[PDB]
Symmetry: D2
Subunit: 382 residues, 4 copies
């Protein structure tokens, strides 16, 4: 804030502020921004004149018609091949030297074409990338608490409306990706899909049937009697991330001893998911538990739709808004087998909750192994 600038490199010192500003003791910025009146023609002149001198770099007192033409395009005027001619004719400056007065006289007399505006620039990267969006659908079938119970998945082409059964394991994308991401680039990507197997506040077991076609969710029934966590209810939604695989075969050079299931995840928002429900989550960290000698990661995440999600930036924020959460999660997994004759479970990294960068890395390795699990089978049989 001070005075109206031209927008080209200049110098303060010898520029005289419009008189109406000085008289009032208000800067020009302030007068044009907040003064209720518009600038007079007298006032615009003194401004355009300063613009003229700016363009007059060789400060010679006039400008060549090629400059006056850039200046015009700089001031916003649409100067086509025709218009430029009309200006020269108007100024009729045989030597092509145009004075300010002659310029200003011409400007004021030709507020250029009205509706000619009807020109719209259409340049565009034209990233013509069309696609039928799918809407995920789930359907239960069978009787709850029996072996027929299954939660099936389908995509609905919201274009054709055709339904197709899909595998929540292979078909639901792991990363939730925007075709054109609008969130600040300064903000890293953290948006994943999560599949609830066991809802918050419940102890009945369910899981993705990795062995059946389309990988529907089934109840864990053994000898015709549904299974349950006897230790107590679960208190967060427990589930899994799609397109991942904790291979029991080490598959790369820093490979661990997976358990052959999609990576496990715990979502800590306030809302209970229903069985097999899918939703976008934000990964906050991870906890490594040992299960029968196998590495059994539990990704800690929170639904993007929870009211506090936006304040939970990493795993250190959880004890700040959900005190007790990470302690209860840790203690619950350490001891859930003891009431069944088992013993406490052990954890890697001293049972500490690793942060999001660490989690996301584990999640990618898991995505990678899921990917290579596809290659081997998807290609060999084919």
């Amino acid at each position: 804030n001070s005075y109206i600038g031209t927008g080209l490199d200049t110098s303060l010192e010898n520029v005289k502020p419009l008189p109406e500003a000085c008289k009032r003791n208000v800067t020009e910025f302030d007068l044009v921004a907040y003064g209720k009146d518009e600038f007079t023609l007298s006032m615009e002149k003194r401004v355009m004149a300063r613009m003229f001198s700016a363009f007059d770099v060789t400060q010679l007192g006039y400008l060549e018609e090629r400059k006056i033409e850039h200046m015009c395009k700089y001031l916003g005027r649409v100067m086509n091949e025709d218009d430029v001619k009309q200006m020269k004719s108007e100024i009729n400056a045989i030597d092509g030297h145009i004075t300010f007065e002659k310029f200003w006289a011409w400007w004021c007399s030709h507020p250029e074409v009205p509706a000619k505006k009807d020109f719209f620039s259409m340049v565009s990267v034209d990233f013509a990338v069309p696609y039928h969006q799918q809407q995920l659908l789930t359907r239960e079938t069978g009787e709850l608490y029996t072996p027929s119970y299954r939660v099936l998945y389908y995509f609905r082409d919201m274009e054709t409306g055709k339904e197709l059964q899909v595998s929540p394991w292979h078909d639901i994308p792991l990363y939730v990706r925007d075709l054109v991401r609008t969130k600040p680039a300064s903000l890293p990507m953290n948006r994943y899909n999560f599949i609830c197997e066991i809802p918050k506040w419940t102890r009945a077991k369910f899981e993705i049937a990795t062995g059946e076609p389309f990988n529907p969710i089934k109840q864990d029934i053994k000898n015709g009697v549904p299974r349950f966590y006897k230790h107590g209810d679960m208190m967060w939604n427990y589930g899994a991330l799609p397109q991942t695989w904790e291979s029991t075969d080490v598959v790369f050079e820093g490979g661990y001893v997976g358990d052959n299931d999609p990576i496990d995840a715990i979502e800590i928002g306030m809302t209970q998911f229903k069985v097999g429900q899918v939703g976008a989550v934000k990964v906050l960290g991870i906890l490594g538990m040992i299960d029968d000698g196998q590495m059994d990661w539990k990704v800690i995440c929170i639904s993007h739709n929870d009211p506090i999600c936006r304040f939970l930036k990493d795993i250190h924020d959880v004890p700040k808004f959900l005190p007790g959460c990470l302690d209860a999660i840790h203690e619950w997994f350490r001891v859930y087998k003891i009431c069944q004759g088992g013993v406490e479970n052990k954890f890697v990294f001293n049972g500490e909750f690793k942060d999001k960068s660490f989690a996301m890395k584990v999640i990618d390795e898991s995505h990678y192994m899921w990917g290579n699990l596809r290659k081997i089978n998807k290609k060999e049989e084919v």
Copy 2:
């Protein structure tokens, strides 16, 4: 399914006896299985697989044939291959093929099926990847603010190659924010659009998408070298435009008003101020129809998906409940923002009512449709 454990096939209550551990104690068997000590382990399993056996014994004869017994085992989830069935008969000492339950149970409780093997994984997946690389929108300011050199430029950063391109915010930023695989309830209509702030909340300096300039950057309205500002007061909401829309002057509304030639206008009512040119997903709540010099001039009312109360504003009727006075202020600001400069109040269609969301989004498709025709005729 709150009493006893069912088979998963169409049955009947009355004639089924709840397993003895339940009756004696007064606890439904379901409650015993779910919350009692595992001691009601091998017992409740016998009683359930019994009734299940009796189910398959439909001609009620007291035994089952070897093709039934094996469909059950499948049903009880045992993984059997041609091989393992062979064993069963062999193990189940019965040269007539009639297998009682006790024979079955004792054999069931015999080994607990060959768990080793290669352990199978169904890979049947539907197919639907999309070859397109995700782009990260980038905005860059250049020039000097309040002079005609100021422009807010847009780019796409290929999140694949990391290559950048200049794009048009008008033509290239999608209007609908579409998920490749929408997970939110089917039951929940889609409502997610991009919004370009031109005029930030609490400010009064005029900015606009330069529809006539290549790549349509954002410019400040400057006339005769002097920047322009709303004299009525500051805009108290982010004011802007929806991309890929066009209110063509070649179109009239119920009365005799034509479109105004710019992308459609929008007002984002969250609490957060957007920076000039900033883009973000919003939810549409309704629309307000104003007339500007005989032209129809819609202002879509929307709220940032990032706003604390966004999930609670379902339709336009909800705004007065959580943001009292907002709709009145908006109406009044637009009704009179010209009186200070000599003009007169503006008039509205629909008696200045804020039309609901369904009505607004209809208006938006139409605006998206004409934009599309403009694309094709010129393309």
Copy 3:
């Protein structure tokens, strides 16, 4: 009042001419005064104070007497003392006392009344201070956790003297959280109670207010030196008590159930875990009636005023809308938390329905009332 500026006294539309600056331009005078340039300064004031003058000129004669002209000036807010009235007449050249408007206006537009003086301030205030010093609740743990030495003690820190006293959480923490001067809408019923967590969310170790111990600290339930824990599973909500309440065994409900002798029970359903003994304001949402060994055992359902969604849960019917599955889980947890140890399910009154808030708070006053009688009989 959207057209022309009114006098503030009972009038009529029809016969009043909108000031000339309005008519010529097409803008109501109200809009000119509120949004046009102050140029419609001295003009619109003349026209308004004119009509006001004509109002007082009720016998419509064209002038007013010196006691009217001075009641107006009062009304137009000029502060006049016996003195200043003297001047007016003196200034207003009129020995008959009949003052036209032009005479008045020219004199009004003459000086703009003696602004100096001592400048007065009305000090009339109602009276109602309260001599009581505010206390800050303090809680202190002592002893060792999971042994019989563990107690959570309570104190009041006088925010005046800074002197501390041991208090009883049961008897001294107020049940109703009352503002000395409630500012929230009168239209909004009062709903703010204190809640004492005994058993934190996600834990299973038994803690209780020691009703038989002096100052009723919080103790862990230990029997025979061994601490006690719910075997069914963890409590998934903060579970506790409301202070200054008593479910006297000397009282029966509709059927034949008597109170259980402890303060009434509560379940706080927010997202945040409370520490053992922690106290906090909650909103009551409803109540669930359970029977425990023939005794009535209410569990008030409440939510921390500090919770993000608290303002959206108005009554018990709202919980399923924002916390789906919560009420079912609560019902089921209490229906069966004894089956694991050999017991049987518990039964409920009202068909296990969660009664609404009005019903619950009624139950709470009654519990507060009996607590009060217990105070007096023993005091």
Copy 4:
């Protein structure tokens, strides 16, 4: 977590963990906490025995009956004058030396009185401090935009229901105080009452009439024409804090040049207050503007009922959740007079927003001067 402790100072090393624990490889804590079964009588014995030895400090193999009596009261038993006698009689230990076996034998045989529990400790600081709570009421009267408009205030004794007119200026408490404050002491007090004079998104003027009886709110009407901010609407709720006074008389040694009105306040939540509406706010900072040479503080605060209040801890948090807010507030006050022929306003402290401790201090000085304004008048005339 390890083994059941006695709760008195001891030593690890030579304490043998219950056999059932060792056999399982589960700690005792884990077995008693999460094991589904209760301890047997055999198991309680071995525990109570360790408790016995604890109390046996002189480790002599038995205890005097005065110890066994403390131990009992320590284990939770109610041992009145009578009960102690009954125990001695039971143990009949002529020398008063009580062995564990004899103790344990006695304990198991007397699970002490049932319903005798009917004893409730009633000790209480008995801070018997009763009071009729008042409910603030407001009523409009007159015609909006005329000189009769006023917003009146009353208290309703919610006991008697009697209504009494009050002064929002003198009667609404400045600090909102809980009789028994339950929020952690570790959390400083920040709860004030605020009176909206000018609602968010409006430009019509209103104010507390410090000159009229009961100090109702009136519209600013001059020459019969209501007044308005011509610069533009206000964008936050603008009002004042009750029981405060920016005296034009300096009143204490670091006294400034007040403007003779209650201190001004700007509440930045999302919700519009109606004229004269009162609500609890949290003070975040303050901005010092000069007005005609007079100090004219503007307290920046936010309603406790706004959804983000709980995340706004001090003035530095505002640019984090409400970017642009402090800039627009600052610029709005700097220039609101320019459109009326005035000039920009100046600020103390370089126009920077001071933090909450600084604000609250200013607010107290203001409360102090309001208080002394009462003394002088409230006493002299009386």
